[PDB]
Amino acid sequence: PFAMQMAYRFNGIGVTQNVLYENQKLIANQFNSAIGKIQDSLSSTASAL
Amino acid sequence: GVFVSNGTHWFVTQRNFYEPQIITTDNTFVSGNCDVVIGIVNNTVYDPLQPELDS
Amino acid sequence: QPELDS
């Protein structure tokens, strides 16, 4: 499952895996907003390519 | 490791090899209560100290 | 600390 994979990936950077399970919806919201900001600041005329 | 289940009983294994064991308080740690984890499961956590030690 | 008491 995806949440268990992300919890194991928090162990690699030195955070215990209960920090993901206790903050799962906040982390999902921050990811879903960061992808949208990537899409916004790419869709406009900021030629980063 | 991870928690697994053979259909009825719950074990704990390592991630890269199947080697199940009995869930005690030496394979686990405790942080919080059971109303914030999405997908929690009722089971028994065995204690390796009380049933052998009385005196 | 207290839990060896019988």
Ligand SMILES: *[C@@H]1O[C@H](CO)[C@@H](O[C@@H]2O[C@H](CO)[C@@H](O)[C@H](O)[C@H]2NC(C)=O)[C@H](O)[C@H]1NC(C)=O
């Ligand atoms: C799931 O694991 C449990 C734990 O080993 C199995 O229970 C054992 O079943 C055997 C039958 O072959 C008995 O001799 C043991 O005494 C049982 N152990 C305990 C602690 O009850 C159970 O059979 C497994 N289930 C499946 C479907 O494999």
Ligand SMILES: *[C@@H]1O[C@H](CO)[C@@H](O[C@@H]2O[C@H](CO)[C@@H](O)[C@H](O)[C@H]2NC(C)=O)[C@H](O)[C@H]1NC(C)=O
């Ligand atoms: C897991 O265990 C808890 C603790 O017994 C269960 O919570 C109880 O559930 C019953 C039935 O819904 C309620 O009548 C009790 O008031 C609950 N007690 C507490 C302290 O929450 C929970 O339902 C169990 N979950 C499963 C899937 O078995």
Ligand SMILES: *[C@@H]1O[C@H](CO)[C@@H](O)[C@H](O)[C@H]1NC(C)=O
């Ligand atoms: C996991 O998915 C099933 C359907 O595939 C769903 O019924 C269940 O509620 C899901 N588990 C959780 C904890 O939401």
